[PDB]
C-alpha cells in the first residue's frame, strides 16, 4: 500500500502536466480559428 500510494502520486502528477499541456494546445488551436 505504501508503494501504491507513491504510484498514485506519480501518475496524478504526470496526468496534471499532460492536462496542462493539452489546455495550452487547445488555447493555441482555438486562437488560430479566430
Amino acid at each position: 500500500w505504501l508503494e501504491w500510494d507513491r504510484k498514485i502520486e506519480e501518475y496524478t502528477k504526470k496526468i496534471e502536466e499532460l492536462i496542462k499541456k493539452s489546455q495550452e494546445q487547445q488555447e493555441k488551436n482555438e486562437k488560430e480559428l479566430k
Binding site: 498514485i8 492536462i19 493539452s22 489546455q23 487547445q26 482555438e30 480559428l33
Partner: protein
C-alpha cells in the same frame, strides 16, 4: 474547427474523469485506513 470543438469536449471529459478518479482515491484511502 469541428475537430477542434470536439477535442475540447474530449479534454473536458478527461479533466472531469480525473476529478472523479481523485474522488475514488479519497474513498479507497478512507476504507484502507479503516480496514488495514
Amino acid at each position: 474547427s469541428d475537430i477542434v470543438q470536439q477535442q475540447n469536449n474530449l479534454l473536458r471529459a478527461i479533466e472531469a474523469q480525473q476529478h472523479l478518479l481523485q474522488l475514488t482515491v479519497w474513498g479507497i484511502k478512507q476504507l484502507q485506513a479503516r480496514i488495514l
